[PDB]
Write a protein that binds this DNA or RNA. Structure first.
Lengths: 209, 148
RNA sequence: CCUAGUAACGGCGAGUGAAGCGGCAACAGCUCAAAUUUGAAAGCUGGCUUCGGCCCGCGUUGUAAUUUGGAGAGGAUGCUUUGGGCGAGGCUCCUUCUGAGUUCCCUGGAACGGGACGCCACAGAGGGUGAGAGCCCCGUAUAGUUGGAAGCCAAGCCUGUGUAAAGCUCCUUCGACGAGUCGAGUAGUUUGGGAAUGCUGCUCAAAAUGGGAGGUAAAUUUCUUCUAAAGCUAAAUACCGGCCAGAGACCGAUAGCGCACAAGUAGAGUGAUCGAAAGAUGAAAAGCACUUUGAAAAGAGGGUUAAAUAGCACGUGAAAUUGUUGAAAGGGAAGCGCUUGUGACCAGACUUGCGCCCGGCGGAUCAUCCGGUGUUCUCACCGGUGCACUCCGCCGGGCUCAGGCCA
RNA sequence: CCGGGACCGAGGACCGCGCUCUGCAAGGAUGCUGGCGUAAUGGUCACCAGCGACCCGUCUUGAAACACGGACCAAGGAGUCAAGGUUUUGCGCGAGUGUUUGGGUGUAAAACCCGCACGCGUAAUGAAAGUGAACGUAGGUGAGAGCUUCGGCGCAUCAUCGACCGAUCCUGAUGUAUUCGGAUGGAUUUGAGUAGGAGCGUUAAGCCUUGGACCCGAAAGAUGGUGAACUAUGCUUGGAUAGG
RNA sequence: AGACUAAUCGAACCAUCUAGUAGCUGGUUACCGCCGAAGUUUCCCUCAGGAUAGCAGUGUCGACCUUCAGUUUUAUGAGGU
RNA sequence: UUAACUGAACGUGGGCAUUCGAAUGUAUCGACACUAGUGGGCCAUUUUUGGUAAGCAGAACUGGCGAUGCGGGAUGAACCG
RNA sequence: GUCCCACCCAUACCCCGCCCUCAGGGUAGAAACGAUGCCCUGAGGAGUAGGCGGCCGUGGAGGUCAGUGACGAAGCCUAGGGCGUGAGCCCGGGUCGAACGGCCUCUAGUGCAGAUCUUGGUGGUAGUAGCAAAUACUUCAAUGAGAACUUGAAGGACCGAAGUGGGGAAAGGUUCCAUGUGAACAGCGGUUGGACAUGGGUUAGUCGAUCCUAAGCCAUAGGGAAGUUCCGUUUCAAAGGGGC
RNA sequence: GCGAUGGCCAGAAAGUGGUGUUGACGCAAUGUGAUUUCUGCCCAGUGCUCUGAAUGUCAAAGUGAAGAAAUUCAACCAAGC
RNA sequence: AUUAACGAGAUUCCCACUGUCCCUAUCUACUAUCUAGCGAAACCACAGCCAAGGGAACGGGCUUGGCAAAAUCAGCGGGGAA
RNA sequence: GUGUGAAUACAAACCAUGAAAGUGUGGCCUAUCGAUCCUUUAGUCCCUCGAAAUUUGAGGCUAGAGGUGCCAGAAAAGUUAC
């Protein structure tokens, strides 16, 4: 029953809403539980980093097209280029994704370099101490400062392009002959008439023959 | 705080400020928007003119990402360059170098033109540009180039 | 968390209402049908056994190895990889032990109260003891210490080895892939799903670059993306029902659960089921010996206690209603407002203060000056010097002024 | 111009207006005297006397009503909470604003610190494809607080005439994938627009909506269970009723 | 005979949905100070009820704007009791 | 718009106070924001409709009760002060 | 009926005192001030429904009074006092026995005469209505504190074999017998009791259950139903028992 | 009304039931109400029942034509009317 | 449309009989009544003498008059719009 | 000072009549009529079917018609003497 100048209300409160209300009084209690689980997990993995390596990926929509972020895993072609066996990759902290493809060459080159330098920073202890092997560390450089996050030490360096650039005068280019505004209008109407123009031209060829 | 509210001042006065003849019954007039066309029409036409009816054609499965293009006027263009570099250009110490502004990196797609521009050449890279905005930037010595 | 009260549905009325992207928590991948071991069913339940094995049976209408689309098979080619046994040390559980006053005086039935003097403190959380206790007692904080049981993790060492099995780089060629299913028509239900989103009944019923999807029905021609009709798997999420624990600006016996008590009890109904009321003597029963009146219940003395104005009808004991004693009023109601009178009872205020003159007593110390210190820098304090017409306290006499109530 | 009577005494150094001018009746009372210093004055309670006075709460044009509820006492007993709006008051920052989904840390449900995204605001208009805000010192005229070298410049706001952007209806230049393109100039049209930004978070009050919604109250409707020990009908098996 | 079916029958009894809805009756708890009403207009299956305008309160800002008036005088129009 | 710078609106400049051109008052100027109650009324002077008439039914201007005590009508919501 | 003198009293009019509201002024080279203070001047006060402002109390939380108390805290009674217009605050006397206040902020299950309100308790009516069907009682002695309704004897009566007699089925569950007894119950009394307290009492080859079937109920073979389960009792079944 | 392949009736369904251990002198459904003497006229209306040459009306499926298809248009056509 | 027998069915008349009536009178048993013992309930704003007036148009309470003397027992059915 | 009905005065086009000035936006004036949703026709040659084209079909924008007489506009027969 409206009485004055009001905004028309729409409050979805006619079911039995009181039976399903979820108050959050355990927000600080839950936080303590997670911190106890992380430090417990870090103790089990004594020299290993907690996280796993991820590749660089671009967002899939025209909006957010500019920014980049972390993905799920490296494609099978990226691993082959860097000379890493498929089966050995998951067991040394590398994450693999078998359902992604490299359509372009810009993305392929960026990820290969990001994965190649990780292999140089890796220290690999031998399976049995008394008998080391060829690919193992020769025990001389096993003592060095290590990292444990691997998400901050290997995060995205810069997601967006630089804000601006400064260039000397007389280097500024010349625009399109017609202009910027007219280049868009011509390109829009060309796609609208792509069908009408093609058939009109084509039927003329059979008409003359 | 309930210690200071009008319900505390009503103690000792029968009917609690709701009147004697009209006794504040349960639901006179109906619940919600009842009577929109019958007995609440007078209120619903003095205010809210246009509640009833159909207008326009419908769109199935609209995705709002296809229609993303925020716009920026031309008089705010110089605010994009950092302050330290900005004062050098306006004061007039460079005299041989021009800035290249990337609208997409700041979150814009269309460059509208509304105000005035000082006479310093610039380079603007935008996805869209208006007809009036292209002229003003061009007569200042600059150029606009589409970037996609 | 946001998208979002948005696209959409709706006597387009009242109303209803998702998803893609984006940030974060937590992260882990895999095995079957379709191939001839065919130069050797290479596989398994059961019984007996000295523990080495044997026997029957299931099974060729298919039991192991090999392959699962990310591939793979079949060929080339050179390198590389793979078993067992010890094991310090660390972490979980239970159990041994832990600092300081009963010092002195007063009130009290009893100090745990008041005053004086002490000590401990990684311990001043909480409870008991005849009243508010850090030092009377149990406990509390800190790392160690006595003894015992079973699982984990793991620094680093000691020994076999290619019959076998595994990884990588390239290729002419091969490359098997789930049917009364998918899909279509019709009917009912449901959804934001709109010429029909999912599900189920009936009729018809496929294919091999084939098939599904691309949110408007249909025909022709292109394009993008996955591989259905077989199967497994930790974590981030829900919950006070079960067994425990720690807490609160929550309630304080008509409150809080129906139940602080022999409460789902006593009780009602043929039955399904309905379902109450009820906490407190005192620090300690020390719960009244003995005499006397009475048939007895009980009464009067006399006792215990700080108190019986605490006596098992017991802490404190209000109102409605009642008894005795004292005062007063009453010719068909009582109560009440304004203003006197009589009688009873009662709070205030007043009972001196200041000043001057004369007389008496007692003391150190008024003006002035010198030294030290402080401070608002010109105003003060302390020590010394004074030494009786000065200064101060008390007493006696005289005088002026003011001070209570009614006129 | 001379008598008689009643009620009252506010203020608290001087200042003023004046006169009959060693002074005064002129901006508010002082002087003399007596009795008593306690139940005397005064206050409380009970009673008699003069005058006045219908039982409260509620609905109603009208209640003391032959309108309803009320024998008496003690304890209990009724506009609350959450989400979403709106105007006004206080506070922080300000073309920006908001730490707490989450992470770091801690004397541990407290306190302190950090950042990527995201929400509202900064740009509107059409059903839609779309397009998108300066002729002028951001305009002219009449009023405007305040300032001023006195000539003038003129905030906020009110009225009025114009300019620009989107929609609707006309006009159709240069050009040309010869059917595309849409310059320029108009029109008793139209918008929740531009014309030197005002918003975001939080605190308190009034009001609104759905929720048990200020408290107590129907005659009904639906889901699942228990009864033939009374009474109704029937079946198998038994019993009982002088003398004319 | 609308009779009887456990003192219940023109549709038995028990628990739950359920604190079922009410434009209709009843009640709604301390004091002082200042201001102070309406039963009328239009629409509604509306007439014991709502929305809308009116009367009322509070919070203010612009000036102290010299503006105004349930009134009289003077000049000039309309009316059919 | 007119045969026509002939008209029409809006303008620049200039002239006219020695008295800004009827009375009285100004114990109350303008604008905006949010919201409560009410929407059953009744009585009286004059005018007035239906009815034999009514403490009956229905209207116009203004004053009252409702929402209000006090002094008169012995008593009496509306009469006189 | 008309005219003329004097006189009586409203919360109305005039003058004065005091309270509150509103409006207009004064107060710093501060010898100054709950500046929210103080001083001077003028006008006004009726009110239901309703609006706003200021204050007083109750249960809890933070800060502060270096607050009160077993030499007596809280609570309760009191025709005993003081303050405020008012809600209320403070003190004196009596009883009692362990905790409790003032001031500024925060918070709410925060103030009662009514609702045929909820639970508990108590009055007038009132020593009143009443304790009247089934024919009926009397003399002596014993026990005992106490005898119409205990016991013995002797008189008078009733039930009058379809009984107020002698035994059973259903149902009840110790009500049966003995000894003893304060209160309560036996609508008067009580030495008596189906009440209270302490003990005791129910023996079967022959009397019943146990055996057989009736109306009727339920398993098995099978068929329905998502299912709790419905039908089916010789039915479309490989269904048994006798001797050495 | 009915000769068992049946009439009346129960059940969510069933290899399920009642009448039925039944067969027209029987089972099932209605009206009048001993005996005596009688029981008239009306088939327009509303019901019940019978006979299909009649083509009038006419569903899904099926048949024919046009179209690139979705689709549209024609005959034929059960019971009932 | 008639109808023998039957009926705790509805109606009218005649004989016998009578306290139904003119018109009332008397007797008996158990209560009511008094005493000893025991001992409730409905109901209740406060209460309880009238005449007229006005008023919500029928007052116990208001106005003007009549009047008015403690405490009590057995009956009664006008009023308390019981 | 919302809607519906009806009415008055101009502006920009195209016409009728009259020699011309002029008159004409239905009947000399005061009554003679109708929302949302849905269906249907006229108009431009216009926009969309959201992976890209071409023709059917469907959906949009502006103006009329199909109607609510309870006429600011629900889809609606009786009885109760239980």
């Amino acid at each position: 029953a409206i009485k004055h100048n009001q905004q028309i209300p729409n409050n979805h409160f006619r079911k039995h809403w009181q039976r399903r209300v979820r108050c959050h009084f355990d927000q600080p209690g839950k936080k303590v539980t997670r911190r106890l689980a992380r430090r417990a997990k870090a103790a089990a993995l004594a020299p290993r980093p907690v996280d796993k390596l991820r590749p660089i990926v671009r967002c899939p929509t025209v909006k957010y097209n500019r920014r980049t972020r972390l993905g799920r895993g490296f494609t099978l072609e990226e691993l082959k280029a860097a000379g890493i066996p498929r089966l050995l990759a998951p067991t040394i902290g590398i994450a693999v994704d078998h359902r992604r493809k490299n359509l372009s060459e810009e993305s392929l080159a960026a990820n290969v370099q990001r994965l190649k330098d990780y292999k140089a920073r890796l220290i690999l202890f031998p399976r049995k101490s008394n008998k080391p092997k060829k690919a193992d560390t020769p025990k001389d450089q096993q003592t060095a400062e290590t990292t444990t996050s691997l998400r901050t030490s290997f995060g995205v360096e810069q997601p967006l392009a630089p804000g601006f650039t400064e260039i000397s005068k007389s280097e500024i280019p010349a625009g399109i002959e017609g202009g910027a505004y007219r280049a868009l209008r011509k390109a829009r109407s060309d796609a609208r008439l792509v069908g009408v123009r093609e058939k009109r031209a084509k039927e003329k060829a059979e008409a003359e023959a | 705080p309930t210690r200071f509210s009008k319900t505390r001042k009503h103690r000792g006065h029968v009917s609690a400020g709701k009147g004697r003849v009209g006794k504040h019954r349960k639901h006179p007039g109906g619940r919600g928007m009842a009577g929109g066309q019958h007995h609440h029409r007078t209120n619903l036409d003095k205010y809210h003119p246009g509640y009833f009816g159909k207008v326009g054609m419908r769109h199935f499965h609209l995705l709002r990402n296809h229609y993303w293009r925020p716009s920026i006027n031309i008089d705010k263009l110089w605010s994009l360059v950092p302050s330290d570099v900005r004062e050098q250009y306006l004061s007039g110490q460079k005299k041989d170098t021009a800035p290249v502004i990337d609208l997409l990196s700041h979150g814009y797609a269309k460059l509208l033109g509304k105000g005035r521009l000082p006479e310093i050449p610039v380079v603007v890279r935008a996805r869209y540009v208006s007809a009036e905005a292209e002229r003003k930037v061009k007569e200042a010595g600059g150029v606009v180039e589409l970037v996609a």
